[PDB]
């Protein structure tokens, strides 16, 4: 989510209940502004949290012009001390498949199944972005120059279009993006209305902790993954 | 010895229809052939067991029924005085099997109904034991995979009424490996 | 009867927990309506269990005295699991729905299933084993299990079946609360394997920890330590609040400033498991009657033997 989600508690307004304290919120505002300074990103959205057993990894994601670029991930344990997380590949996706369990706060932790916790952080954040990173329909407009920009004239979805999974897009490489109605399982997405139905909350069931914010009246949107960081393989049993 | 009422020939021992009681206390009602048992009839044991069906030499064969002392019961095909071929067995707690038989044992294809829970095990049987590929039907889940030692073993597979599968693997006793992705078929 | 859920919300906000100030005050007024409508001695915002279509705003309630093969019976009165009546509510303002009693033979021994909530209390629960009840009974099952595993308090605060407020609780420091789990204990009764908190004789004793058991013994899932502890507002540690993250029921939380405490669940209502969810195996397939001599051939006597016996 953008900085507008850190001037007000947009995260906890979704009713998921997990988010940032005002301490972390103000610290994150200053730190993500400094990240946009130090790293010349077009925008610096707060990706979310990986709730560990010792400390939580506060995650930020760099956005280029060129928003479907291979987005650059950053991590921080004490919020402000932001550090450039390495990018993800297919080998590191295959590497962590033998490991299961909750994240440890120290990213130097080792698993004997060695495997670094930093590699787990990189791979799990990549998997969450490829699976359940949400963009509402029409928020991004494929520019004729081979580059994706913000559709800066985007009006929020009509309330008729709110209830359809077709009106929401996977924020990744592929109206250009893939819609959520093919995201198997068919019931894998939960759509609910809060705050007088001026608020659409769309939570991932396959990756619990994701909660996508959207205000239909305006263009205020964003997604945050605040959760344990594992994939709910039990989803078809649970549906 | 016991006693009986029925018909016979001059030389033949018994070949008509009637009732016979034995020294051991059990009784019979029905058909019989020369010094032996043949055709439709009815057993009645002292222990509470029964049978209704056909015989050939002195053995249960063809269509028939059986009531056991413990309350379990069976009908279907018999052979060589043993359960054989297609048949249906009912156990003391309303669970039932229906399927093939081979020498008093579950063998080949057959369906076992878990009447306690409503689920069904459907697939191969080997000597009374749930082994081989089989399809375990729950209310909305349907597990496809191999069984061994009355337990799922091997790769795959679940099918769901929600419109997706879930591939996996069984390694230890009732333990599921790291589950693979969902399929669309 | 109505507690200050807003001060608890302010303390929840220090750890990034809570529904937001406006929604939390909305639930506060809903709890006020619940207290005015019904004769409630004590209540508290138990939590909010997320659902697929609609959520629940769970409210633990304790009423005043005297107003409002083998089947293991339930705790009919306020003993054990059914000590608190649990009211739920989808959005605030919609009237509160009284959830039913927990049944040990049926509802909390159906823990072997693990399912989402649809938001509809009347929606059917299809699982293996077949769940004996609707979504309301499963919601009660998960609430009871979450309470048994997550309702915790500091080491003092009550003297000990039953307990009362400790008047001489000097208070444990927040750093002492965070550094070890021996300073925290379970505030409610453990649920036995049969589903009850107090054993019923079906005709050996299955025993759980006592009430005043430290939660350091509450382990574990593949050596993952339960109750991850941290300090809220680390930049100003001398006004911190001891945060507790269960790691057995995600979304379950415990909090304390060193003097008072409160508990709160905000998860999906499910237990964490490192292993993937195994549906439980069916019962063992039962065998036929053994092929003994008691059900064997009649072996009718031959007429030659009858003639032999007749000659007498």
Curated annotation (Swiss-Prot), chain A:
Presence of keyword Metal-binding: no
Keywords of this entry: Cell projection, Cilium, Cilium biogenesis/degradation, Cytoplasm, Cytoskeleton, Flagellum
The keyword Zinc is assigned to this record: no
Alphabetical list of InterPro entries matching this protein: RSP9
GO biological process: axonemal central apparatus assembly; axoneme assembly; cilium movement; epithelial cilium movement involved in extracellular fluid movement; flagellated sperm motility; mating; radial spoke assembly
Signal peptide: none
Localization of this protein: Cytoplasm, Cytoskeleton, Cilium axoneme; Cytoplasm, Cytoskeleton, Flagellum axoneme; Cell projection, Kinocilium
Knockout-associated phenotype: RNAi-mediated depletion in the ependymal cilia results in a near complete central pair apparatus loss and alters the ciliary beat pattern from planar to rotational. Multiple radial spokes proteins, including those in the head, are markedly down-regulated in the cilia.
Tissue expression pattern: Expressed in the testis, trachea, lung, oviduct and ependymal cells (at protein level).
Main location: cytoplasm
Gene Ontology cellular-component annotations: 9+2 motile cilium; axoneme; extracellular region; kinocilium; motile cilium; radial spoke; radial spoke head; radial spoke head 1
Assembly and binders: Component of the axonemal radial spoke 1 (RS1) and 2 (RS2) complexes, at least composed of spoke head proteins RSPH1, RSPH3, RSPH9 and the cilia-specific component RSPH4A or sperm-specific component RSPH6A, spoke stalk proteins RSPH14, DNAJB13, DYDC1, ROPN1L and NME5, and the RS1 complex-specific anchor protein IQUB. Interacts with IQUB. Interacts with RSPH3B. Interacts with RSPH4A. Interacts with RSPH6A. Interacts with CFAP61. Interacts with LRRC23.
Assigned protein family: Belongs to the flagellar radial spoke RSP9 family.
Protein name per UniProt: Radial spoke head protein 9 homolog
Organism field: Mus musculus (Mouse)
Curated annotation (Swiss-Prot), chain B:
Biased composition (Basic and acidic residues): 5-15
Cellular component GO terms held in the UniProt record: 9+2 motile cilium; axoneme; condensed nuclear chromosome; cytoplasm; extracellular region; meiotic spindle; motile cilium; outer dense fiber
MORN repeat start-end pairs: 4-27, 28-50, 51-73, 74-96, 97-119, 143-165
Keywords per UniProt: Cell projection, Chromosome, Cilium, Cytoplasm, Cytoskeleton, Flagellum, Meiosis, Repeat
Renumbered residue ranges of the record's region Disordered: 1-25
GO biological process: axoneme assembly; epithelial cilium movement involved in extracellular fluid movement; flagellated sperm motility; mating; meiotic cell cycle; spermatid development
Protein name: Radial spoke head 1 homolog
Complete-protein stretch covered: 17 to 201 of 301
UniProtKB/Swiss-Prot annotation, chain C:
Subunit details: Component of the axonemal radial spoke 1 (RS1) and 2 (RS2) complexes, at least composed of spoke head proteins RSPH1, RSPH3, RSPH9 and the cilia-specific component RSPH4A or sperm-specific component RSPH6A, spoke stalk proteins RSPH14, DNAJB13, DYDC1, ROPN1L and NME5, and the RS1 complex-specific anchor protein IQUB. Interacts with RSPH1. Interacts with RSPH3B. Interacts with RSPH6A. Interacts with RSPH9.
Stated family: Belongs to the flagellar radial spoke RSP4/6 family.
Function: Functions as part of axonemal radial spoke complexes that play an important role in ciliary motility. Essential for triplet radial spokes (RS1, RS2 and RS3) head assembly in the motile cilia.
Protein name as it appears in the record: Radial spoke head protein 4 homolog A
Inactivation phenotype: Mice show hydrocephalus and the tracheal and ependymal cell cilia show clockwise rotation motion instead of planar beating. All three types of radial spoke heads (RS1, RS2 and RS3) are missing in the tracheal cilia.
Record's subcellular location: Cytoplasm, Cytoskeleton, Cilium axoneme
Source organism superkingdom: Eukaryota
Tissues where the protein occurs: Expressed in the trachea, ependymal cells and oviduct (at protein level). Abesent from sperm (at protein level). Expressed in brain, kidney and testis.
């Amino acid at each position: 989510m953008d900085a507008d989600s850190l001037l007000l508690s947009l995260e906890l307004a979704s009713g998921s209940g997990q988010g940032l304290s005002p301490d972390r919120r103000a610290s994150l505002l200053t730190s993500l502004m400094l990240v946009k300074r130090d790293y010349r990103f077009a925008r610096v959205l707060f990706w979310g949290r990986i709730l560990g057993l010792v400390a939580d990894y506060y995650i930020a994601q760099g956005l280029s012009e060129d928003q479907l670029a291979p987005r650059k991930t950053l991590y921080s344990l004490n919020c402000t001390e932001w550090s450039l997380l390495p990018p993800a590949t297919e080998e590191m996706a295959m590497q962590i498949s033998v490991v299961s369990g909750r994240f440890m706060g120290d990213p130097s932790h080792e698993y004997e199944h060695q495997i670094k916790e930093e590699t787990r952080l990189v791979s799990i954040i990549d998997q969450i972005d490829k699976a359940v990173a949400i963009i509402p329909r029409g928020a991004l407009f494929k520019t004729p120059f081979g580059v994706t920009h913000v559709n800066r004239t985007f009006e929020g979805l009509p309330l008729s279009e709110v209830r359809k999974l077709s009106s929401y897009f996977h924020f990744r490489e592929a109206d250009f993006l893939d819609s959520l109605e093919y995201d198997i399982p068919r019931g894998s997405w939960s759509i609910q209305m809060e705050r007088g139905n001026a608020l659409v909350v769309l939570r991932s069931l396959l990756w619990p902790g994701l909660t996508f914010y959207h205000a239909p009246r305006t263009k205020n949107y964003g997604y945050i993954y605040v959760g344990t960081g594992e994939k709910n393989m039990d989803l078809p049993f649970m549906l | 010895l016991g006693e009986y009422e029925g018909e016979r020939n001059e030389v033949g021992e018994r070949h008509g229809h009637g009732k016979a009681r034995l020294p051991n206390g059990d009784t019979y009602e029905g058909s019989y052939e020369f010094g032996k048992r043949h055709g439709q009839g009815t057993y009645k044991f002292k222990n509470g067991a029964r049978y209704t069906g056909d015989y050939v030499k002195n053995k249960k064969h063809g269509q028939g029924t059986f009531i056991y002392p413990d309350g379990s019961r069976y009908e279907g095909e018999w052979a060589d005085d043993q359960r054989h071929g297609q048949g249906v067995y009912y156990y003391v707690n309303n669970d039932t099997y229906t399927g093939e038989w081979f020498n008093h044992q579950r063998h080949g294809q057959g369906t076992y109904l878990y009447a306690e829970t409503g689920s069904k095990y459907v697939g191969t049987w080997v000597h009374g034991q749930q082994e081989g590929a089989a399809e375990l039907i729950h209310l909305n889940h349907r597990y496809q995979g191999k069984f061994m030692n009355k337990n799922p073993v091997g790769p795959g597979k679940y099918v769901f009424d929600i419109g997706c599968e879930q591939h996996g693997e069984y390694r230890l006793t009732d333990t599921e490996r790291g589950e693979e992705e969902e399929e669309e078929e | 009867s109505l507690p200050n859920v807003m001060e608890s919300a302010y303390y929840f906000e220090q750890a990034g927990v809570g529904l937001g100030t406006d929604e939390t005050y909305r639930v506060f007024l809903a709890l006020k309506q619940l207290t005015d409508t019904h004769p409630i001695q004590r209540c508290r915002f138990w939590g909010k269990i997320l659902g697929l279509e609609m959520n629940y705003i769970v409210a633990e309630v304790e009423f005043r005295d005297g107003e409002d093969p083998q089947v293991i019976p339930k705790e009919e009165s306020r003993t054990g699991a059914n000590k608190y009546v649990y009211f739920v509510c989808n959005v605030p303002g919609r009237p509160w729905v009284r959830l039913p009693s927990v049944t040990p033979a049926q509802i909390v021994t159906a823990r072997k299933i693990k399912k989402f909530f649809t938001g509809r209390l009347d929606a059917a629960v299809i699982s293996y084993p077949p769940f004996p009840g609707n979504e309301s009974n499963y919601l009660r099952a998960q609430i009871a299990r979450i309470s048994a595993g997550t309702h915790v308090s500091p080491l003092g605060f009550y003297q000990f079946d039953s307990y009362e407020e400790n008047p001489d609780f000097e208070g444990i420091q927040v750093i002492d609360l965070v550094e070890s789990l021996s300073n925290w204990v379970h505030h409610v009764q453990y649920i036995l394997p049969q589903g009850r908190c107090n054993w019923f004789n079906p005709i050996e004793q299955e025993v759980g920890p006592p009430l005043l058991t430290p939660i350091s013994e509450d382990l574990g899932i593949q050596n993952i330590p339960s109750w991850t502890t941290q300090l809220s507002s680390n930049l100003i540690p001398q006004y911190a609040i001891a945060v507790l993250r269960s790691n057995l029921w995600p979304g379950a939380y415990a909090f304390s400033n060193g003097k008072k405490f409160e508990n709160f669940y905000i998860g999906w209502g499910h237990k964490y498991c490192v292993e993937n969810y195994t549906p439980p195996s069916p019962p063992p397939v039962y065998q036929e009657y053994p092929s003994g001599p008691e059900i064997t051939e009649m072996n009718d006597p031959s007429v030659e033997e009858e003639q032999a016996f007749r000659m007498t």
